[PDB]
Structure formats: structure tokens, C-alpha cells
Coordinates of C-alpha atoms and ligand atoms in Angstrom, one line a residue:
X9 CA 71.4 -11.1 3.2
X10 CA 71.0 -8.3 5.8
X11 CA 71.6 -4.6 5.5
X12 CA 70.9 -1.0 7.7
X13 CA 67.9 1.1 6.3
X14 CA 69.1 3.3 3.7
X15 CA 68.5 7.3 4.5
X16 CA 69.6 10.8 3.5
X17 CA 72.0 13.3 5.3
X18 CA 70.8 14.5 8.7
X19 CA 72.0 17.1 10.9
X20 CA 74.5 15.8 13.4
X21 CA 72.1 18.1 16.4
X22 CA 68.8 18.1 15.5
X23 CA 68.3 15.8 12.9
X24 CA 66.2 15.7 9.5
X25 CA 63.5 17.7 11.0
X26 CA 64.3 21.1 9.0
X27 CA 63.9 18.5 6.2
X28 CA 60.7 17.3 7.1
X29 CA 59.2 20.9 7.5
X30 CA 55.3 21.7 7.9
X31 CA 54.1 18.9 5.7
X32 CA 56.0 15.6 6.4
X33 CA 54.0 13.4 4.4
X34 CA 55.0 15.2 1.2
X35 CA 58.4 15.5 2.4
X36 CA 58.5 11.7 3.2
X37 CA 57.3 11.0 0.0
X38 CA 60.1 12.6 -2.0
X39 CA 62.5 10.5 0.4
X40 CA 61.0 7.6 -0.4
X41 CA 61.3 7.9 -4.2
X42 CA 64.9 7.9 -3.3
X43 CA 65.4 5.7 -0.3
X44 CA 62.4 3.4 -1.3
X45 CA 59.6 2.2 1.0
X46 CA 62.3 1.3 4.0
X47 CA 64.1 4.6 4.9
X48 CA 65.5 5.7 8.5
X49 CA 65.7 9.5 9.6
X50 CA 66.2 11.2 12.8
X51 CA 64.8 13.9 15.2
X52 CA 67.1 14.8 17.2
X53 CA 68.7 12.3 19.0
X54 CA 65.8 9.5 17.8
X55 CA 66.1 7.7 14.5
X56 CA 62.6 7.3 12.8
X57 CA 62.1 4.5 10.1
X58 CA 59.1 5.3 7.8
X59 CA 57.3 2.4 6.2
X60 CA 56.3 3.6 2.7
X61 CA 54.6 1.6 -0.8
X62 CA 51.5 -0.4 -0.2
X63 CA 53.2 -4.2 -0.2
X64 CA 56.2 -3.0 1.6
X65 CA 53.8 -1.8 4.6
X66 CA 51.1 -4.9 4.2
X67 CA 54.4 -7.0 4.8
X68 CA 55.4 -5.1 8.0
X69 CA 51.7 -4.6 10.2
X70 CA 49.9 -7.7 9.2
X71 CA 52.5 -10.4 8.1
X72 CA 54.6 -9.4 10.5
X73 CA 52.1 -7.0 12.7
X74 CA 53.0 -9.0 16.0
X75 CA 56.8 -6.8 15.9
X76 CA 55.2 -3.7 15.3
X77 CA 52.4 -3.4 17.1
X78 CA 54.0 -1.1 19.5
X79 CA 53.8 2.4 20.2
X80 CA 56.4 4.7 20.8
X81 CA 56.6 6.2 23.9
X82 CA 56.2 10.0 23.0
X83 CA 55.3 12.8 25.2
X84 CA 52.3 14.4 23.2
X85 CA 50.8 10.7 24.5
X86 CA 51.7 10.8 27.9
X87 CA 48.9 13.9 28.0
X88 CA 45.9 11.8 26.1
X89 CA 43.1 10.3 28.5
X90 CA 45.7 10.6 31.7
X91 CA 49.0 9.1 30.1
X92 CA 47.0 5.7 30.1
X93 CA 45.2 5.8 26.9
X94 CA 44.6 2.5 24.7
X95 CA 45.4 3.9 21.7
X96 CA 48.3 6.2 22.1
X97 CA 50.3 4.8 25.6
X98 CA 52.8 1.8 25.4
X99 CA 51.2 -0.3 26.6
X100 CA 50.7 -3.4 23.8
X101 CA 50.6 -6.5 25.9
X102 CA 47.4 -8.6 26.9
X103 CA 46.8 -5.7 28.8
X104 CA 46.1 -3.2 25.8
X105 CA 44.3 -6.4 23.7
X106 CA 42.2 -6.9 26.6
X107 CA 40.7 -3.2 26.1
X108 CA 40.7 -3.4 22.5
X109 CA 38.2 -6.5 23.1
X110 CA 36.1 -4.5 25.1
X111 CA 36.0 -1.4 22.6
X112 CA 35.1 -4.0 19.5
X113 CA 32.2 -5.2 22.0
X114 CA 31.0 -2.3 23.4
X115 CA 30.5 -0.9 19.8
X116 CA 29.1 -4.0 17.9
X117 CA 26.5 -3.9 20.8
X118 CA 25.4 -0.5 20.6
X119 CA 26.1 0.2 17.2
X120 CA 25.1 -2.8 15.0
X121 CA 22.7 -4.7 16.8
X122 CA 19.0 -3.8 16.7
X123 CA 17.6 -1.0 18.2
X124 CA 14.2 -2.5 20.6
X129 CA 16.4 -0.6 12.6
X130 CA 19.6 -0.2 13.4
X131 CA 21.1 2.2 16.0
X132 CA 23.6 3.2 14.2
X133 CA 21.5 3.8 11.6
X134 CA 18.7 5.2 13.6
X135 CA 20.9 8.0 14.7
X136 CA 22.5 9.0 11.7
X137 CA 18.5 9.7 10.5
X138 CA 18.1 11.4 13.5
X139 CA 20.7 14.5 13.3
X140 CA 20.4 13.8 9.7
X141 CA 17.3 15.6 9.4
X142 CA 18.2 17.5 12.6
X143 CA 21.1 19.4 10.6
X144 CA 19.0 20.0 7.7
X145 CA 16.4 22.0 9.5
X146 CA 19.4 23.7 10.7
X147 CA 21.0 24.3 7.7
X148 CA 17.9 25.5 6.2
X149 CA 17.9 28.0 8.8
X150 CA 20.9 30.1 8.1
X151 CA 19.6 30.3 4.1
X152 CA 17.3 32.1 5.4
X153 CA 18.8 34.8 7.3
X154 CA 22.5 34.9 6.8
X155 CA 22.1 33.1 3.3
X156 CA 25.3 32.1 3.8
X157 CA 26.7 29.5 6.4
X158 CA 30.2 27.3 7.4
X159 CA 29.4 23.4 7.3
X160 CA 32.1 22.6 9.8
X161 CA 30.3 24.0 13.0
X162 CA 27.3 22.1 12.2
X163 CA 28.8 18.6 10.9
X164 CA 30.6 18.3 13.9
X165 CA 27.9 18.7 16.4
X166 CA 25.5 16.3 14.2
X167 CA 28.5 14.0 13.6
X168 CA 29.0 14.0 17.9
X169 CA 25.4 13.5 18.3
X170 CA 25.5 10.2 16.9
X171 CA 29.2 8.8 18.5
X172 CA 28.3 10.4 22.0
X173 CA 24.6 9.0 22.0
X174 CA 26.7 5.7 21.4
X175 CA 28.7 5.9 24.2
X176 CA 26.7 8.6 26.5
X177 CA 22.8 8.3 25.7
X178 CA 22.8 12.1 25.2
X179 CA 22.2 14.7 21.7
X180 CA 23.3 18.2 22.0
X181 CA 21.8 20.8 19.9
X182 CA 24.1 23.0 16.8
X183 CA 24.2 25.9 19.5
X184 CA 25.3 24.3 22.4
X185 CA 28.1 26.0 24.8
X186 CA 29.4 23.1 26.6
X187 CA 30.1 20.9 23.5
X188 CA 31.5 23.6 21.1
X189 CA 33.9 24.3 24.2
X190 CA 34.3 21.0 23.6
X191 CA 34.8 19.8 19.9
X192 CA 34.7 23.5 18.5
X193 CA 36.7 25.6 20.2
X194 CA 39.5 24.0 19.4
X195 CA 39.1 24.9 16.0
X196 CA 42.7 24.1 15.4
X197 CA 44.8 21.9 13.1
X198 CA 45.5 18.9 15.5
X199 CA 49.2 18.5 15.2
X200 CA 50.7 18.0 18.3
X201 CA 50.0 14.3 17.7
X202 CA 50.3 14.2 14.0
X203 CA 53.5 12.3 13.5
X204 CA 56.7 14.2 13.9
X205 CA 55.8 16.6 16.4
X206 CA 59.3 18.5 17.7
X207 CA 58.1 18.2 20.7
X208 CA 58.5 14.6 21.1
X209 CA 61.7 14.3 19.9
X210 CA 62.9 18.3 21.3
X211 CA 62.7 17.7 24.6
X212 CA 63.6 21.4 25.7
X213 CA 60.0 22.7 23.3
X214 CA 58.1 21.1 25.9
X215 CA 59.1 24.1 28.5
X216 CA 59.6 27.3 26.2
X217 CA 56.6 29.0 25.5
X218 CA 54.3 26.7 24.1
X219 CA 50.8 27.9 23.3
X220 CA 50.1 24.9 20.9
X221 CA 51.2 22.4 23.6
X222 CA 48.8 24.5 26.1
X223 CA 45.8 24.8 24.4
X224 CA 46.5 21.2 23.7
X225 CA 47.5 20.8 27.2
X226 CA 43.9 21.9 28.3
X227 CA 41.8 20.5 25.9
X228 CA 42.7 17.2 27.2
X229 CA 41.7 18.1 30.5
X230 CA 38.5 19.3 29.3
X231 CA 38.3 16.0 27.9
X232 CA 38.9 14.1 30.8
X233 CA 36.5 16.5 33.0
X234 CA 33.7 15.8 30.0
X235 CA 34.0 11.8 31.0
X236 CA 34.1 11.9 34.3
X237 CA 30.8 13.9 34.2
X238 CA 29.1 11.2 32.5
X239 CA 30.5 8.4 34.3
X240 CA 29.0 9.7 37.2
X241 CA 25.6 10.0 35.9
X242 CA 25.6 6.6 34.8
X243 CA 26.4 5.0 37.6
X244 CA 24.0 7.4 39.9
X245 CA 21.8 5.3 36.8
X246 CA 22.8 2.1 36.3
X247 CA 20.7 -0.9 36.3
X248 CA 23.0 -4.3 36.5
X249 CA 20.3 -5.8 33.6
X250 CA 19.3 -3.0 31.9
X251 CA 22.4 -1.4 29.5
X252 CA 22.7 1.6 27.4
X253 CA 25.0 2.7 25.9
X254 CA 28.6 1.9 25.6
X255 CA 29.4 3.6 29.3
X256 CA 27.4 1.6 30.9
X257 CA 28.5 -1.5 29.0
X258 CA 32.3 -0.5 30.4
X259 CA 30.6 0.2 34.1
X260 CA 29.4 -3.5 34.1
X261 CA 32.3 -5.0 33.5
X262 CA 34.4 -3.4 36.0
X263 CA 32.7 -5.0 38.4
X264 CA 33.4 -9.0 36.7
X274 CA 45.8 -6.2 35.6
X275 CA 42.9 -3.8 34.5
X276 CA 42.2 -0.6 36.5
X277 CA 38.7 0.6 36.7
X278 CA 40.5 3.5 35.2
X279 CA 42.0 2.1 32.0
X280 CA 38.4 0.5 31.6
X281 CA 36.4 3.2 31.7
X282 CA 38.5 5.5 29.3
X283 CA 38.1 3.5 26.7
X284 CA 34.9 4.8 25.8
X285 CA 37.4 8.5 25.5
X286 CA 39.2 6.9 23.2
X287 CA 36.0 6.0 20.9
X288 CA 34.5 9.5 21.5
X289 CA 37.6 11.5 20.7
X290 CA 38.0 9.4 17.8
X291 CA 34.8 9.2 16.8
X292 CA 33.7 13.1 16.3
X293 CA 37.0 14.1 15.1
X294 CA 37.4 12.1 12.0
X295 CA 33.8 11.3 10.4
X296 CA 33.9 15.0 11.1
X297 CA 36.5 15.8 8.9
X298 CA 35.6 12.8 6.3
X299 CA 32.1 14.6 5.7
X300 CA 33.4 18.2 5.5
X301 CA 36.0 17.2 2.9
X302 CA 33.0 15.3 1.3
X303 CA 30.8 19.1 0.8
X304 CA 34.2 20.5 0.1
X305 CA 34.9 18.6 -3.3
X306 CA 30.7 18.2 -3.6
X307 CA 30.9 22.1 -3.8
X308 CA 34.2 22.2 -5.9
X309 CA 33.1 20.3 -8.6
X310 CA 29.5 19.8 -9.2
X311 CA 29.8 17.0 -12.1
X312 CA 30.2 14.8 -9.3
X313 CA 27.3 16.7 -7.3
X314 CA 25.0 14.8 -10.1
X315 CA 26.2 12.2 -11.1
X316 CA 25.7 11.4 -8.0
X317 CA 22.1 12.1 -7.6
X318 CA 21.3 11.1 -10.7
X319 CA 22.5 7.3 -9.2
X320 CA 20.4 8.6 -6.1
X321 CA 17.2 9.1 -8.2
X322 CA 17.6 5.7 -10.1
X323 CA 17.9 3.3 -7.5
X324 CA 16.0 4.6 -4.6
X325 CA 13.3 7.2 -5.2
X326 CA 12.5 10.9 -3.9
X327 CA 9.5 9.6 -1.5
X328 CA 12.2 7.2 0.3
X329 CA 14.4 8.3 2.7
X330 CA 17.6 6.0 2.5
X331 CA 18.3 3.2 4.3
X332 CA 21.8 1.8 5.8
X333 CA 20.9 -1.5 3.7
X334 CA 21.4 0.8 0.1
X335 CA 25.2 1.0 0.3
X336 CA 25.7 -2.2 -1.5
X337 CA 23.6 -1.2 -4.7
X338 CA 24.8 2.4 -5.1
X339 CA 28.3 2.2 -6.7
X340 CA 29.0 5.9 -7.5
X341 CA 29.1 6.4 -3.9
X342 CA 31.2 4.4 -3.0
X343 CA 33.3 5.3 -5.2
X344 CA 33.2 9.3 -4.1
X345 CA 33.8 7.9 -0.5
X346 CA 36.4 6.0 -1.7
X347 CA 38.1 9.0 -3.5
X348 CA 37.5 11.4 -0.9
X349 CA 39.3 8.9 1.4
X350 CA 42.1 8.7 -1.1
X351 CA 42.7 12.1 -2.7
X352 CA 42.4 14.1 0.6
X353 CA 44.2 11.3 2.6
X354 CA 43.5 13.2 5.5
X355 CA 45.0 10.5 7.9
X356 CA 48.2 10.9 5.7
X357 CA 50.3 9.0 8.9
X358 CA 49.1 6.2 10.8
X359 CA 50.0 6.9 14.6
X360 CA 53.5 5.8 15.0
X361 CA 54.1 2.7 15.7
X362 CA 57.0 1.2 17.4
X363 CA 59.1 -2.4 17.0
X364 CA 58.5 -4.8 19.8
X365 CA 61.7 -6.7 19.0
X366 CA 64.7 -7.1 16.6
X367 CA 63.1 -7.9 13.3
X368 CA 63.6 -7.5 9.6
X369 CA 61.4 -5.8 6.4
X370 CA 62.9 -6.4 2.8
X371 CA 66.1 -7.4 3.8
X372 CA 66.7 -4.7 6.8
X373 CA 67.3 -4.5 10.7
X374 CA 65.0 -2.9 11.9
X375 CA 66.3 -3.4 16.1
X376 CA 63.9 -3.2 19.2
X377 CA 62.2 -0.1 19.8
X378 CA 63.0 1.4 16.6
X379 CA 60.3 4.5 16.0
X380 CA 58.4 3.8 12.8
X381 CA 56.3 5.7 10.7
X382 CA 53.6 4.8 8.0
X383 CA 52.9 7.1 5.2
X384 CA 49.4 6.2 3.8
X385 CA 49.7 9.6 2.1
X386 CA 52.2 7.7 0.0
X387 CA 50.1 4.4 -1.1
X388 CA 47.4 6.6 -1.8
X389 CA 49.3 8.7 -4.2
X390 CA 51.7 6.5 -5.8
X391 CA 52.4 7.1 -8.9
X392 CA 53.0 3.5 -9.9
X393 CA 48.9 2.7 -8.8
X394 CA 46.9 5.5 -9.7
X395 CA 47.0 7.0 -13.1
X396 CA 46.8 10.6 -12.2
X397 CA 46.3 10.6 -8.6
X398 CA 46.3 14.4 -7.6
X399 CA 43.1 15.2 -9.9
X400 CA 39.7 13.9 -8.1
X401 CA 37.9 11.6 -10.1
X402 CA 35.7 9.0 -8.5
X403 CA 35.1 7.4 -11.6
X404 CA 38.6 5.9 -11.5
X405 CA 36.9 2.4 -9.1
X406 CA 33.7 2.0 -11.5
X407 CA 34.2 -1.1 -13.9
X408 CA 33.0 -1.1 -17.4
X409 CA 29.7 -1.8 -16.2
X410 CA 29.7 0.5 -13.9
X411 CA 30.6 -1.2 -10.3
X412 CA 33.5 -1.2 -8.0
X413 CA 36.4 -2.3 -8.7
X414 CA 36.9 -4.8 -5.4
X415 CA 40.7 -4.9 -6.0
X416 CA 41.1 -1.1 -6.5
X417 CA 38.6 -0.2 -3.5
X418 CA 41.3 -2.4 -1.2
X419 CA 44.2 -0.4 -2.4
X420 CA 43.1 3.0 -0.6
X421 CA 44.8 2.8 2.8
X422 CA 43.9 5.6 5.5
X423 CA 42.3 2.9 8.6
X424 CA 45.7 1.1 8.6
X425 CA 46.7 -3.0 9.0
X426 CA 47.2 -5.1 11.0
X427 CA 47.3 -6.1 14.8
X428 CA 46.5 -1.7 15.3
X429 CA 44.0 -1.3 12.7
X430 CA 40.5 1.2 13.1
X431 CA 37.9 -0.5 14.8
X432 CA 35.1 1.8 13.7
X433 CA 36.3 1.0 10.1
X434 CA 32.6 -0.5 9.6
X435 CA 31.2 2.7 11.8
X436 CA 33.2 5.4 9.7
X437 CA 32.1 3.5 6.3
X438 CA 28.5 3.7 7.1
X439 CA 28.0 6.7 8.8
X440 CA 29.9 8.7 6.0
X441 CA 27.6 7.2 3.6
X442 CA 24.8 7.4 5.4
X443 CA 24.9 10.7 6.3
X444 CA 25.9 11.8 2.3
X445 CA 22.7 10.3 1.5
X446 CA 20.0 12.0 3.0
X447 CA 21.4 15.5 2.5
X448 CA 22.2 15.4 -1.3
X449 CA 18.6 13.6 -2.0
X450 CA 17.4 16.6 -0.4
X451 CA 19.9 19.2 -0.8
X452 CA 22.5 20.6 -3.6
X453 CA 25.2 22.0 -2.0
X454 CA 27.1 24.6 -3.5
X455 CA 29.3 27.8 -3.3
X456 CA 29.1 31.4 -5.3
X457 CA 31.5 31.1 -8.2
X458 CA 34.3 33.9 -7.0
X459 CA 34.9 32.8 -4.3
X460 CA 38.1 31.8 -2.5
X461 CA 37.9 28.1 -1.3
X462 CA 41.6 27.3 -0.4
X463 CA 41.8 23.1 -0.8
X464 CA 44.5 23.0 0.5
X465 CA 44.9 20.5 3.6
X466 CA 46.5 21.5 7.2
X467 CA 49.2 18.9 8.9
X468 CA 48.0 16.7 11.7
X469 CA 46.6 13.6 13.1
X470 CA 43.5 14.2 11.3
X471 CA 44.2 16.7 8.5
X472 CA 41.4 19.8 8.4
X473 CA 41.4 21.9 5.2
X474 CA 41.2 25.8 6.1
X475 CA 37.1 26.2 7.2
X476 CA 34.8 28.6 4.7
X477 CA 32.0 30.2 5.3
X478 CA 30.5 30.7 1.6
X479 CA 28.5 27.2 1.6
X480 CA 24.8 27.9 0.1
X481 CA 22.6 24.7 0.3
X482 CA 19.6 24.3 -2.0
X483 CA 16.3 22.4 -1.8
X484 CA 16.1 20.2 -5.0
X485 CA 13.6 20.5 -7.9
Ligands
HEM501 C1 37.3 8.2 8.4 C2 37.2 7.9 9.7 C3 38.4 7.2 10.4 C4 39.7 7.0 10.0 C5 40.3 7.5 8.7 C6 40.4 6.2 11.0 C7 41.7 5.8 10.9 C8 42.4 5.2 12.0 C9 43.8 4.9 12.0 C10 44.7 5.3 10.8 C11 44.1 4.3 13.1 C12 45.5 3.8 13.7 C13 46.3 3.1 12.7 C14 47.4 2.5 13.4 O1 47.5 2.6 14.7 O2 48.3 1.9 12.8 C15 42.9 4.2 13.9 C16 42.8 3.7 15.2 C17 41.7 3.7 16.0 N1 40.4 4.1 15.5 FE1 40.0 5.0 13.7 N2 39.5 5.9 12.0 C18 38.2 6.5 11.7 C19 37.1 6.4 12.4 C20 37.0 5.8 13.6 C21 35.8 5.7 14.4 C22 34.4 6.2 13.9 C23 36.1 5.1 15.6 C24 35.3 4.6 16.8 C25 34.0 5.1 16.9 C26 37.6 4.8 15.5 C27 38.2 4.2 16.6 C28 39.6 3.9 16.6 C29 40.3 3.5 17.7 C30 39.7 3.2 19.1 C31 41.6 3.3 17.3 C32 42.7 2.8 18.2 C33 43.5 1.7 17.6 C34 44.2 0.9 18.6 O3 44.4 1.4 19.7 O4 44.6 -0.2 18.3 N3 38.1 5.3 14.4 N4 41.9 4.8 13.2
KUV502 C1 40.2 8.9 21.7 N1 40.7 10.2 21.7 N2 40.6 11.0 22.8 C2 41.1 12.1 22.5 C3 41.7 12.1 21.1 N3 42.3 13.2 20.6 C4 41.9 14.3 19.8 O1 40.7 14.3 19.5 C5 42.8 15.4 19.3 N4 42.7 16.8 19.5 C6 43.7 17.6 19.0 C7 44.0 19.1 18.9 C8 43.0 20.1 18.9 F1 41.7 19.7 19.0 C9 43.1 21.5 18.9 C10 44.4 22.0 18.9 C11 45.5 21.1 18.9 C12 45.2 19.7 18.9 F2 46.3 19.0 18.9 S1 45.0 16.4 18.3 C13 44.0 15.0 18.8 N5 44.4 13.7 18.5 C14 41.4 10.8 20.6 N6 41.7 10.2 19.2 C15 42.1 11.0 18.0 C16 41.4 10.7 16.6 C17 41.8 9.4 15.9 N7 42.2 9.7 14.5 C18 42.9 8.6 16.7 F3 43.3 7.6 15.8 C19 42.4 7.9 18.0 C20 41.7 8.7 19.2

């Protein structure tokens, strides 16, 4: 037959959202043992439905991904790269697939492809070693140092040489301005932000919303800048980087404008969350050290200590990806997908879902369910290894966190790789640790892109 979404109580005025709180994934997931994986809320005035449990949600973005391949029209977007963003505006036609084309191409071609070696891989190398000099550095006079400030900067090295043909060195001004200063939590986007569905928290005093306000327009100023340079350097044959593939093509509807962003929206993904993938990474490294060898004792079997890894080793080194794969899981630090919206009257499990309908999608919740993992809130990588000791190719497909679909990450393969790569050539080289005594607080911060809170106790070592 056909029924409503199911749902709890919600105030009459503002809705659920004193409900939801400071964590909404957790909160969400509670609902959802109650509600099950098609429940409906409301902030404010707008009713939210949020997709939980991993078939429920396949069924939704992939089977039926061509009715929800929308995206809402919030106001937190309206301020990304000038209202006119790929990723986060309405737009969803041919017009949006046309750009998402263009992004696929521009990074297979400058990413994959060989390098006249790989250049993604020849990159990683590059501020691979760069960031161990540098970490080397602050044992010696500080003793003591904060892997955050550095990651990102090595981890923006590689995505902005991608797209820009430029490096910038740990103590830069300009780019810690950029990707630094924020040193925030990066909420205003995470789903459910008051904002969007509070119209009147737009006006009040809003520091969040202004700091957030003017980082985008620092963002927008930072690609401008190099737009310019290219094309005072542009040779019609000779391409470099994805910027220049974008410049090309707007000379073959499409603005120049909503062209030439696109390569934002790859940078600003790009540093933000490979950034935060390898910082979790030293923070369970660090927190449990088991894991800090049995993962170099895989490292000394299969490739050596007079061998510096290479991007083809992923394949024959199953304890890492396993640890990938749980620090992906565990951490679930892309707990929400960005919200997605219906592009017409459909159904899900028996439901109406009409068109328009806000929709959220709690990958928090596959990754922690209950009914999949055993005991999925302690960290153990070892959970994917078979019997004889490789992954688990069913399990490994189970950990959700790039989405499905028609709206899924296209630097999936990029993210995969780079994490690993990177992970490699430190811990062959380095042990990682902290001073037992310590507070490290695990505990993860709300947002798009959930941060943990930064500490500054991390003490690398040079291996025997
Ligand atoms: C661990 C690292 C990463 C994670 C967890 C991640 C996750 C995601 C998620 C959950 C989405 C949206 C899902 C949805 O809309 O339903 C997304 C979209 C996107 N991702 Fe990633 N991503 C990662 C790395 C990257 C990288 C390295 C790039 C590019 C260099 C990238 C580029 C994009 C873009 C352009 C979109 C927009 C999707 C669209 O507009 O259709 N991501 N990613
Ligand atoms: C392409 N592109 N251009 C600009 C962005 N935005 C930011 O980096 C960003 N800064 C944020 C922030 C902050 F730093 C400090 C204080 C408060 C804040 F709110 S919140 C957010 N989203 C993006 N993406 C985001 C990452 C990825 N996961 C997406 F899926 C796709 C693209």
C-alpha cells in the first residue's frame, strides 16, 4: 500500500530541533531505532525526512537516485563559491551533470594519468617527505608539535598543485589565512544548521555565520587570483593543471563563471577532508599503538626499509586497508551526506515521500549499526581481515561515508589513495606517538566534515 513517514512529536513553532541538539547524527540515530530507516522531522516550518540503515538508503540514491538527486535550497549554500556552486546550489539538471563531467575529467587528467609515475602519486612523495623534514624539526626544539597545522598544508599542497600548479611551504601566511585560520568546526553546512531553517538567525548577531560569511569570500578572492595568472599564462596546446583544463573549455547554458568554480569546489573539498581523514588517522595511530605495529610489521614484510612506497602497493598490504577502512568507519567523520532534496513525488518502503521534500542521510548510522558490526564503537581494524588475513570485499563495501548514487564523491579514488599513500611513507619512517598522561579528548565536533578537538602533545620518532 501507501503510508506518510512515521516520526516523533515536534514542536508546533520550531520544530524537532531542541531534539536534534549539538550532535544530530547521534540524535537521529536513536529516532531511527524507533521510527526505522524512513522517519520525517521538522525545523521550523520545514519537514526533514532522514534516510537511515544501509539497504534502506542504497534503495533511495542509486535505485532510485534519479528522485533524489536534488539539493535543497538552503541558505548556508546560497554563500558557497557565489550562490552558484556545483555541489551545494539547486541546480541538478543537465546543467549541474554537465560540470560534474568536467570535474571527473579535469581530475582523471591531472591526477591519474602519467606524469611526462603518477601525479597524483608524485605529489603525495613530494610533501610527503616535505612534512617529515618538517616534523623532524619541531622534535628538535619544541619536542613537542600539533599534526593538524602541518597535515593540512602538506595535504593542500598536493590538491592545489592539482588544480593551481603551485606548493606552499608549513609557514605560509596567505594559506593558513586560508585553510588554518579558520580553525573552526565547520558546521554552518553540516546538516541541520538553524540557520537554514530559522530564518530570523541569519540577522541577529551571528559570528559563526560571519566568520563563515568571510571565509567564503576569501575563498572566492583566492580563485580569482589564480585564474588570472593562468590565463596571463595559458598556452591553448600546452595544459596544466586542472585550471587551465577549465580555461580551455570555456572557450569550446554554462557561464564562464559556473565553469571556472568548479575547480573551488575540488579545492575546498579537497584540503578539507583528506585533511581530517589523516589527522584522525595519527589520532587513533597515537591512541592505540597495537595497531601502530601491526601495521609496520605488514610494512616491513612486503615492502622493505630501503624502498620508499609506491601507489601500486595498496593492493598487497591488507592491514591498511583495513585501518583506513576503520578510521573511515569508527570516526565517521562525514556522519551526514549533504542534504539532498526530492526531484518529484516518489516513494521509499512503502512511503510518500512528495516533491521537494528535504532529506537527510545518516552514514553515521550504517556505519554503526548494531545489526552489522559486532561491537562497533571500539576501533579494531582487524574486524575486515579474513582468516587468511585479507579484506573482507563484502564488509569493506559496507562502510559508507562517500555516499551513492547519481551525487556520489568523485575524488573517492583520490581520497583512497592519497590517504594511503601518505600513511605509508611516514610510519615506515616514523612512530608516532604521545606522552602517556596526557589529555587527548576523542571526541568528535559536529559538521560537514567532523574535526576532533586539535592537540599539541604529538612526539614523532625515527624508527630503529
Ligand atoms: C575522505 C575524504 C572524502 C570524503 C569522506 C568525501 C565524501 C563526500 C560526500 C559524502 C559527498 C556528497 C554525498 C552526497 O552528496 O550525497 C561528496 C561530494 C563531493 N566530493 Fe567528496 N569526499 C572526500 C574527498 C574528496 C576529494 C579528495 C575530492 C576532490 C578532489 C572530493 C570531491 C567532491 C565533490 C566535487 C563533491 C560534489 C558532489 C556533487 O556535487 O555531485 N571529495 N564527497
Ligand atoms: C568545494 N568547496 N568550496 C568550499 C567548501 N567549503 C568548506 O571548505 C567549508 N568551510 C567551513 C567552515 C570553516 F572553515 C570555519 C568555520 C566555519 C565553517 F563553516 S564549512 C565548509 N563546507 C567546499 N566543499 C566542502 C568539503 C566537502 N566535504 C564537500 F562535500 C564539498 C566541497
Amino acid at each position: 500500500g501507501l503510508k506518510n513517514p512515521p516520526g516523533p512529536w515536534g514542536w508546533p513553532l520550531i520544530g524537532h530541533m531542541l531534539t536534534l541538539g549539538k550532535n544530530p547524527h547521534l540524535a537521529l540515530s536513536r529516532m531511527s531505532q524507533q521510527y526505522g530507516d524512513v522517519l520525517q522531522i521538522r525545523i521550523g516550518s520545514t519537514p526533514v525526512v532522514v534516510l537511515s540503515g544501509l539497504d534502506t538508503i542504497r534503495q533511495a540514491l542509486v535505485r532510485q537516485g534519479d528522485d533524489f538527486k536534488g539539493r535543497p535550497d538552503l541558505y548556508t549554500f546560497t554563500l558557497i563559491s557565489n550562490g552558484q556552486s556545483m555541489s551545494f546550489s539547486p541546480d541538478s539538471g543537465p546543467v549541474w551533470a554537465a560540470r560534474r563531467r568536467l570535474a571527473q575529467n579535469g581530475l582523471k587528467s591531472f591526477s591519474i594519468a602519467s606524469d611526462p609515475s603518477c601525479y597524483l602519486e608524485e605529489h603525495v612523495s613530494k610533501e610527503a617527505e616535505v612534512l617529515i623534514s618538517t616534523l623532524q624539526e619541531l622534535m628538535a626544539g619544541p619536542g613537542h608539535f600539533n599534526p593538524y597545522r602541518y597535515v593540512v598544508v602538506s595535504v593542500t599542497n598536493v590538491i592545489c598543485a592539482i588544480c593551481f600548479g603551485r606548493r606552499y611551504d608549513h609557514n605560509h601566511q596567505e594559506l593558513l589565512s586560508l585553510v588554518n585560520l579558520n580553525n573552526n568546526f565547520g558546521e554552518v553546512v553540516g546538516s541541520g544548521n538553524p540557520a537554514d531553517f530559522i530564518p530570523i538567525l541569519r540577522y541577529l548577531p551571528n559570528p559563526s555565520l560571519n566568520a563563515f560569511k568571510d571565509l567564503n569570500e576569501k575563498f572566492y578572492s583566492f580563485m580569482q587570483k589564480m585564474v588570472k595568472e593562468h590565463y596571463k599564462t595559458f598556452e591553448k596546446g600546452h595544459i596544466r593543471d586542472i585550471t587551465d583544463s577549465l580555461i580551455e573549455h570555456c572557450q569550446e547554458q554554462l557561464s564562464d563563471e559556473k565553469i571556472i568554480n568548479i575547480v573551488l569546489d575540488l579545492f575546498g573539498a579537497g584540503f578539507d577532508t583528506v585533511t581530517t581523514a589523516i589527522s584522525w588517522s595519527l589520532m587513533y595511530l597515537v591512541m592505540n599503538p597495537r595497531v601502530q605495529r601491526k601495521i609496520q610489521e605488514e610494512l616491513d614484510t612486503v615492502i622493505g626499509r630501503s624502498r620508499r612506497p609506491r601507489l601500486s602497493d595498496r593492493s598487497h598490504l591488507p592491514y591498511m586497508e583495513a585501518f583506513i577502512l576503520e578510521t573511515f568507519r569508527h570516526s565517521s567523520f562525514v556522519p551526514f551526506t549533504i542534504p539532498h532534496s526530492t526531484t518529484r513525488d516518489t516513494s521509499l518502503k512503502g512511503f510518500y515521500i512528495p516533491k521537494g521534500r528535504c532529506v537527510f542521510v545518516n552514514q553515521w548510522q550504517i556505519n554503526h549499526d548494531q545489526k552489522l558490526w559486532v561491537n562497533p564503537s571500539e576501533f579494531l581494524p582487524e574486524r575486515f581481515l579474513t582468516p587468511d588475513g585479507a579484506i573482507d570485499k563484502v564488509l569493506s563495501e559496507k562502510v559508507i561515508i562517500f555516499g551513492m548514487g547519481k551525487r556520489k564523491c568523485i575524488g573517492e579514488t583520490i581520497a583512497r589513495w592519497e590517504v594511503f599513500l601518505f600513511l605509508a611513507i611516514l610510519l615506515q619512517r616514523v612512530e608516532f606517538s604521545v606522552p602517556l598522561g596526557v589529555k587527548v579528548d576523542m571526541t568528535p565536533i559536529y559538521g560537514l566534515t567532523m574535526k576532533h578537538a586539535c592537540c599539541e602533545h604529538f612526539q614523532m620518532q625515527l624508527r630503529s
